[PDB]
Design a protein around this ligand. Sequence first.
Ligand SMILES: Nc1ncnc2c1ncn2[C@@H]1O[C@H](COP(=O)(O)OP(=O)(O)OP(=O)(O)O)[C@@H](O)[C@H]1O
Ligand SMILES: Nc1ncnc2c1ncn2[C@@H]1O[C@H](COP(=O)(O)OP(=O)(O)OP(=O)(O)O)[C@@H](O)[C@H]1O
Ligand SMILES: [Mg+2]
Ligand SMILES: [Mg+2]
Lengths: 485, 380
Amino acid sequence: VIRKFTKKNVARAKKKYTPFSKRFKSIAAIPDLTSLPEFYGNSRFENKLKTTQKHQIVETIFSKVKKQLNSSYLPARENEFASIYLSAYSAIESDSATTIYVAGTPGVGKTLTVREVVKELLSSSAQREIPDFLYVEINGLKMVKPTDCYETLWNKVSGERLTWAASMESLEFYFKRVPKNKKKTIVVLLDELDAMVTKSQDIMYNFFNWTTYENAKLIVIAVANTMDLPERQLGNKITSRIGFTRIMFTGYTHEELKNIIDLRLKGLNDSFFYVDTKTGNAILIVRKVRLRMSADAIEIASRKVASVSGDARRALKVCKRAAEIAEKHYMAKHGYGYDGVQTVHITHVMKALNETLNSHVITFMTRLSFTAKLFIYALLNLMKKNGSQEQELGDIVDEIKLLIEVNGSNKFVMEIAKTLFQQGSDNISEQLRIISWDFVLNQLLDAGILFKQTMKNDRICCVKLNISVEEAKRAMNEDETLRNL
Amino acid sequence: SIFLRTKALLQKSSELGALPARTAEYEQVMNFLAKAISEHRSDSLYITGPPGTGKTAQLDMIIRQKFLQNLSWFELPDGRLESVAVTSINCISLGEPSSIFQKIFDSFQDLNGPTLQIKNMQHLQKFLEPYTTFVVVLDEMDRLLHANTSETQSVRTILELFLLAKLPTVSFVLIGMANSGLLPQTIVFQPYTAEQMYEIVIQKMSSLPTIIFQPMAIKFAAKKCAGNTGDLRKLFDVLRGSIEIYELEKGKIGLNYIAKVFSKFVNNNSTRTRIAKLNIQQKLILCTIIQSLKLNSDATIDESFDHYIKAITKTDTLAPLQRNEFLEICTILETCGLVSIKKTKCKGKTKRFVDKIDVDLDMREFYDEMTKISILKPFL
Ligand SMILES: Nc1ncnc2c1ncn2[C@@H]1O[C@H](COP(=O)(O)OP(=O)(O)OP(=O)(O)O)[C@@H](O)[C@H]1O
Ligand SMILES: Nc1ncnc2c1ncn2[C@@H]1O[C@H](COP(=O)(O)OP(=O)(O)OP(=O)(O)O)[C@@H](O)[C@H]1O
Ligand SMILES: [Mg+2]
Ligand SMILES: [Mg+2]
């Protein structure tokens, strides 16, 4: 039979379709699910990235600082920790179902605090003072489909693999109908909650409505990026079910950021290493070299990061970048390779803070060819003349031609005009566009300096500056020929 | 412990044949049930209200206390003990609205017997002829409309359910709960008042031996939760947070802990306090942003920086900044909470995505704070 089209790359997973409501013939037929060999959590890829180390790498004096300042390795979050821990501990011990809403800006320790809470709760459950529970982590930005959370959570509960709809009625049956004595408490971290927001808002309603069921024993800890998300994007039902209590994670102050960086720099700052002068490898306790990172540098970086974001990721990255600048200068000075006091100074911290601030756009426009600068000058002249933010390309052509033909008496124009309109050549006729006109137009379009509308007539097509006008003016009058005229 | 058990009773999943403040609605639903089961007449009920007014709790109490799978007895005031089969279905947790008839069959037919495939209300209508009154309670039936299509196919499911609960010689009633002559009988659950909230809280806590609350604190919390649309869930969160703060900061707990709840979980940030934490340069850039949005109101970062440069060369206050430093101070104003930078399409002849400035601050206290600084009034 001849097909009208073919699907030759269909990949379908082995997911059954029958939900949990039809496993057993009755409510009384369900056993205690905590004793089943597949329920409640009862990797093979870690050896694939193993190789044979046949070299000896050199770890220098600043290597331990850069490795230790990473995000992989709880001082300033102790009230939020106490709130989340006490609510979750009361919900576990009473066999209740509870929503905990946590919101905040990036890098302020939300995921870290919730993970530390569930580690202390699992340790407390290991001492047999609260009942045992299953911890499920669902990240909305780590899902392909938003409904895959239905796939994930049920797979964490039962060990079955079903399609998302059947998983959704399975979770509904499990949370409402199964009694508490046959169940185990489940703590779910929903992280990046906004990523799980759809048009129907069914996932939001289901996940927060299961926390209103008497038999559920479900604790949902939802992490948001804003506090006004349930009012702005969600309905009144979901906003009512989330609750009035909402824990806000403020951005870190510079005392808190300094405490975080000093906590990572305990045992390394004001310490001595044994450093080989032949290769460069350094050992924590041949020369005895003292390593310092100054507290004034850390406080400058902490104050800047705390005013801009209050982000622990940025504070740690600025400190690591300063140490890498110092370590690059160190390897340049001593000639070390990749096989008495060394200090991360305040100047490295200022360089790390200024390298994301130095405005390469003006430098890029300064280092362009004469035709691109002439294009930008003509466009700026038209914006000065007729006062419009969008200029037609034919007007730019005509005003470039006027700029060449009026200030001819400039010696540079007498040098450049034959190049511009004939490419320095007899037997090439005079050209309506300049040489490399489309080249510099496409080059300024690639950089994001220009916006061009989508028209097929090249003369009436409009061009707008996407960058600010003042930086284009200062780049243009940096040029000695264009500022002369 | 009394604190743990009191917090357990004040959860939003906590349970308690009439609810304490829903006696009239209970008698309405039971007289509808009397005129339904006793007459052997199919009929449709439609229960409506704002969230938290206790519709789902009242129907759950009715099903649990006063009532093929799920077969039970219904007792009349006469007391003839009719045979009923009651089920409750939450409509949002179904994958499609078209399969709910099947789930009604999946709520009623026994697993040992044959399992017919119900496609529509015709098959269920055929299924209910040889019978025993069938009671369904559809929660969130309002999610039985379709978000796509138009008027016609959106009502495709609720009208076929209403016809199935109105045709003769069946015993299928339909109770529908939704959020705010074959038409269903309408009951509107009302938002609670402060005294109703107080009586519900005292009735739920009457199982406890010792009340850890002063009654004036419960009255204060109930009267703050008794607004235009005030629900019992907010009162439960407020009281539970009162125990939370009380045992985080350490007897009958005071009225002051309710105020501590309403201050801790309402970030009542003032534009006064936000402007007062800035320096002179952040205040100046805030003023230039305000003026640029006053004159353009669809303005980019780069046009606002152009306006800042023009104003700072017209007035000559301190030294002008570079575009990236301007953007960094704009993000500082985001961190303080006065300026927001979004990413939106343009509406010109060259429509692309650009960074856009919106302001969420009110003009009066902004101009009042900026009036007191003399070197800023050229920018006002
Ligand atoms: N209080 C803290 N003490 C020590 N390190 C911290 C602290 N807060 C944050 N960090 C560091 O910052 C990293 C990022 O924090 P985290 O992942 O918790 O951020 P987040 O607020 O969840 O951000 P996002 O919204 O981007 O997910 C942590 O892994 C850790 O290295
Ligand atoms: N009269 C009452 N007595 C005791 N608890 C009540 C009462 N009314 C409501 N509640 C409790 O308040 C919560 C909300 O009740 P319910 O689920 O019935 O709300 P609803 O009106 O169905 O709202 P929604 O549209 O949000 O579902 C539940 O915890 C319920 O036990
Ligand atoms: Mg996170
Ligand atoms: Mg309800």
